[PDB]
Amino acid sequence: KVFGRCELAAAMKRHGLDNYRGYSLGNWVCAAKFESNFNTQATNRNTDGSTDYGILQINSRWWCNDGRTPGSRNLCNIPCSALLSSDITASVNCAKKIVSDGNGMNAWVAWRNRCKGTDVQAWIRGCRL
């Protein structure tokens, strides 16, 4: 599923990501735009042989099982394919664990380089939330 911007903002808010660990909703929407273009089916392979999955590009090296990242962990205790669903519940619940691990949203490279420090509220401007 390719979400619209406000559609995804509403879903993330309903799932409790607005201000989670102090990160306002616009930070999450910005991160998802540049990680996945709001496409739940996005996948990208990393240099180490892990893969990033879903709207927030969650990595199989640490967070989910894909069966092909030998030596990896599965700290969200989920198959990586759950992160590709049109329902973002699994991606949100796993993201909550990632952003709590000590490094905040720096875990997301696109957030660090394209969202951090910017006017992220612009990403939810005009939405009825």
Ligand SMILES: O=C(O)c1cc(-n2cc(CO)nn2)cc(C(=O)O)n1
């Ligand atoms: O493709 C776009 O740029 C786009 C698409 C949508 N979409 C809205 C929906 C709902 O059915 N799907 N895409 C919203 C926006 C926007 O708020 O700027 N922008």
Ligand SMILES: O=C(O)c1cc(-n2cc(CO)nn2)cc(C(=O)O)n1
């Ligand atoms: O209506 C929109 O949501 C929309 C429209 C355009 N359009 C761009 C052009 C060409 O000038 N026409 N609509 C771009 C975007 C976007 O980049 O999010 N979004």
Ligand SMILES: O=C(O)c1cc(-n2cc(CO)nn2)cc(C(=O)O)n1
């Ligand atoms: O917190 C992370 O997972 C993270 C943070 C950084 N950061 C690097 C800097 C400063 O240059 N800030 N976070 C890089 C990486 C990575 O290569 O996977 N990962």
Ligand SMILES: O=C(O)c1cc(-n2cc(CO)nn2)cc(C(=O)O)n1
């Ligand atoms: O006006 C639009 O169509 C629009 C504007 C932005 N904006 C994104 C930013 C952040 O720099 N400001 N407007 C995003 C989108 C979209 O994601 O579809 N769409």
Ligand SMILES: [Cl-]
């Ligand atoms: Cl929308």
Ligand SMILES: [Cl-]
């Ligand atoms: Cl915001």
Ligand SMILES: [Cl-]
């Ligand atoms: Cl594996």
Ligand SMILES: [Cl-]
């Ligand atoms: Cl393969």
Ligand SMILES: [Cl-]
């Ligand atoms: Cl599994």
Ligand SMILES: [Cl-]
């Ligand atoms: Cl933080």
Ligand SMILES: [Eu+3]
């Ligand atoms: Eu648009």
Ligand SMILES: [Eu+3]
């Ligand atoms: Eu990292």
Ligand code: NA
């Ligand atoms: Na906000």
Ligand code: NA
């Ligand atoms: Na699993």
